[PDB]
Amino acid sequence: MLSKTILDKLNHQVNFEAASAHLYLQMSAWLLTQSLDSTAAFFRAHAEEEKAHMMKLFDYINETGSLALIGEVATPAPEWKSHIELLEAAYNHELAITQSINDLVDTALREKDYSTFQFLQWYVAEQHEEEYLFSSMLHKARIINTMDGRALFRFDEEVRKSV
């Protein structure tokens, strides 16, 4: 049932989600060497989310009667010079995942594979939540990197406690 062009892209996405999990594990490890334990925990937990994204694609492909393929996943050693450089990478990575999902949705629509189109709506929605999460965490890291910013956040925290 799946066309070869769609199958190859779905398998590419399986592999991409797998690579994301590994990337976020690797980030988690690096963060622990900086004593950023909560950020490390976030990336660890989020690696588990990427695994679930992977498995859901993997299952869809197999349910259609084609054979899902994991492929090669290569995770570069940690280059990152600061936590902000790492958060920029994470956010750009999530933008690239969104691009890949959008290309996939577009090609399903173009081939009139409506079944794959509707299956992918879950991912379109999930990537909105992902971009919000990662862009927001980056934005806050940049602000907290400044003294003026830390003062803003001190006021915001006062509002969280007081009202």
Add this chain to the structure above:
Amino acid sequence: MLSKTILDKLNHQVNFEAASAHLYLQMSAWLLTQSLDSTAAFFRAHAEEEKAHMMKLFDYINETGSLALIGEVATPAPEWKSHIELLEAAYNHELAITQSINDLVDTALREKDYSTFQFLQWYVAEQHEEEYLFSSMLHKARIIDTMDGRALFRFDEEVRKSV
């Protein structure tokens, strides 16, 4: 992330939903002067539904990283000469909202903004329920405005009680 054309239309829709809430509040107030207390209660409750429609758009916009805008909302004083004229206005208003949502869906599809496209599906579905609700209430009002009609409804009520 949001294109300017889609942002301006989403903000237009925010403002439209806000205007709907105010419209239905105003209709409620007029209906009370006619002693149509249950219809008034329906329009009051439904103003709260429109507020929820508004907020959900407002949140989506803000989550994407753009700034949602409420704008100007102008509610004309009650012109209505009968409850049927009011129900016609409500139904036409809901048709216009559906038009506006469809235009928005169409333009997201055209720009390949699949994220906004999938976000809007909730509204497409909700507007089907809205049209059904308002058209049906109008149709009943027209029937109940005739003696033959009030006899039909008396039978239908007998069936509701008997079986």
Add this chain to the structure above:
Amino acid sequence: MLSKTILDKLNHQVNFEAASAHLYLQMSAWLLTQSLDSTAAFFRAHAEEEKAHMMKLFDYINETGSLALIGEVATPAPEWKSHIELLEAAYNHELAITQSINDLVDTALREKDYSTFQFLQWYVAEQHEEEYLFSSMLHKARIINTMDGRALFRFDEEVRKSVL
């Protein structure tokens, strides 16, 4: 039953409360662009409070037999250059609402509309709580904007954890 002068002022207040809700929604949206998420949440929640103020007026008017009117509500785009400028605007706005309620109470008393006078006592009380809430939030923002102030609040927070 309601005199025209009181009706016009109650309908003005309906509209004013509606404009407050929108104003606070708009402030919430701006605050999110500054990553002030808790302050944004506070203004969002408070927009809901202003809606309740509106509805309560709206219902009173309708219960008396008159027709409540929503009117035009115009919310300017966000001008604000800082969170402090926004909190000043919010506080001044709340002072204006109080003024408007006081005028309304005064005119009910003058016309001997004792029914509207007593209905409004809820608002007089509520506006005392509103001014306290917003003035206090502004004051804390000004303090926290200074290093000496942040140190005071660090001590206060130590007291919240250690004793109270």
Add this chain to the structure above:
Amino acid sequence: MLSKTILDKLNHQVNFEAASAHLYLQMSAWLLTQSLDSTAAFFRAHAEEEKAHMMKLFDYINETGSLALIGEVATPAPEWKSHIELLEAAYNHELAITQSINDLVDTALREKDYSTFQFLQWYVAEQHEEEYLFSSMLHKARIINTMDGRALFRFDEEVRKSV
């Protein structure tokens, strides 16, 4: 502690509330001769409300150290030619009570008897609810007395069941 002018007016009000109870009992009895059983039940129940209004005044007076007086209460036999005439009489009677309460509030304010002023606010609020209740019931009775009106109410009842 109470001035003579205020005491005489509070006692007048005690008597006025007592007369209202008896008036509403008498109306209830008349309504039963017309087979208006639900309206009769409403007036019967409301006679009990007027008694509570009476007792609360009665107590306030006694708590201040003065002697509450019931006085003479005379209830005319039922003149009423229709249920609308009776509802008009009930509404006008409630207006008169409100007048009497307003005169009492005004005179407490004028004498700077702030204690009686604040005690009466309960009555000012209650009379707003009473006027709403009785005006609304009269309005509906007038509407339901016409065929056009009975058609409006049939639609309103449809809305109560349908939504």
Add this chain to the structure above:
Amino acid sequence: MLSKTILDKLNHQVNFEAASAHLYLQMSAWLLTQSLDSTAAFFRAHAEEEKAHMMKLFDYINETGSLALIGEVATPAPEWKSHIELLEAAYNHELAITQSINDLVDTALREKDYSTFQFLQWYVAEQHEEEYLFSSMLHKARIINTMDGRALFRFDEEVRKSVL
């Protein structure tokens, strides 16, 4: 926000309620020397009520952004020659508190400080309850000071047991 004339009067009232608490504590102590243990307990408990009146004023003042002031409170040693003389003093003291609250209400109305006016309604209502309580206790003490009176109360107590 509070005018100086209203602030000064609210602070005066804070101080007056504080003095009441101390007065009633002192009365309690005297009553114990007369073996009037239940009356002593009543005054002791009531001192706690007066403290609550004080704190509620104190909080309002601070919430408006002004600074509440406790001031000097002087409690004279117990002069009282009988329990009736003490109950008279308590009743007159409550009459004076009512006067002071009425003056405060009147001045809030005159300045159109409707916020303080509505805040004070609680006190107007409470002072009605206080005058009822204290006048009634005094009246009973006077009656029970007579033979004829003790016979009336004996009948009233028989009704409390037999019927009510």
Add this chain to the structure above:
Amino acid sequence: MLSKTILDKLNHQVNFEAASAHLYLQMSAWLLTQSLDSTAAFFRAHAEEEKAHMMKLFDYINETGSLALIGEVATPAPEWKSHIELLEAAYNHELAITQSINDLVDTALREKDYSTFQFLQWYVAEQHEEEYLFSSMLHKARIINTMDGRALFRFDEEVRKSV
């Protein structure tokens, strides 16, 4: 039963505890004008503790058959130029209360009033808790007033969260 010298000192202490309550209320009020809301709450609550210390003395005196006297309590308006000056005043005030209790204990021992000696042990214990509380709060305020100090506390707070 109580000697005049012990009675006069116990009554002095009653008055001293009453003055402490009023002092702490006044400090609370001043602290609110500085937006130090938690510190204000602490002093407000602690005024209630002082009012308990007072009552316990007041009851003991009365139970011995003497007449407890409240006396004159004068609370100066708030002079304080900073929160540290206020805390210093509070701590010194607590040192003076301890001195007064000690003098009282010493004089009960000297007169062989063992009953008052043992009654006062509660206060000797309580004042140890009071001095610990107030000294510790003052010390932290002085530390937090320095940048080096704020850094120490940031570490200490990290230990509270981490372990």
Add this chain to the structure above:
Amino acid sequence: MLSKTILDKLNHQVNFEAASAHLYLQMSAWLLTQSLDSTAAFFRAHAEEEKAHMMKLFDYINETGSLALIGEVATPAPEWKSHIELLEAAYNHELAITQSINDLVDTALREKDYSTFQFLQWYVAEQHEEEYLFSSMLHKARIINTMDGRALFRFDEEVRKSVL
């Protein structure tokens, strides 16, 4: 706040209670080599009590604003030739602790350090319980070391089962 003489004695006592815990642990270990398992358990559990005595002193000192000092604690290897010799050493050790507490109480009284005096009353009471516990255990060990004694205890045990 603490005088240098009282501090030095409270720290000495901290160290004395620490040495008691270690002493009783060491006694426990020796008793296990004699197969006196219950007596070993008692001393083990009691070492934990001595630790609590230590910590309570340690805390008091620190709360006053001085620095508590543990010092050197030296526990000799087990010399004991019999369980009775050990119980004698334990009892005498408890007598010495009591002496030390008394000296401390006496010095606090002399310096009019009433705060340390009242804190120490807990220990005075506790040491009464300790002497009772250890003297009684020694007394029983001496009795049970004789045949006449073992017969008395057999009767006492019969009373524990039959009546009490």
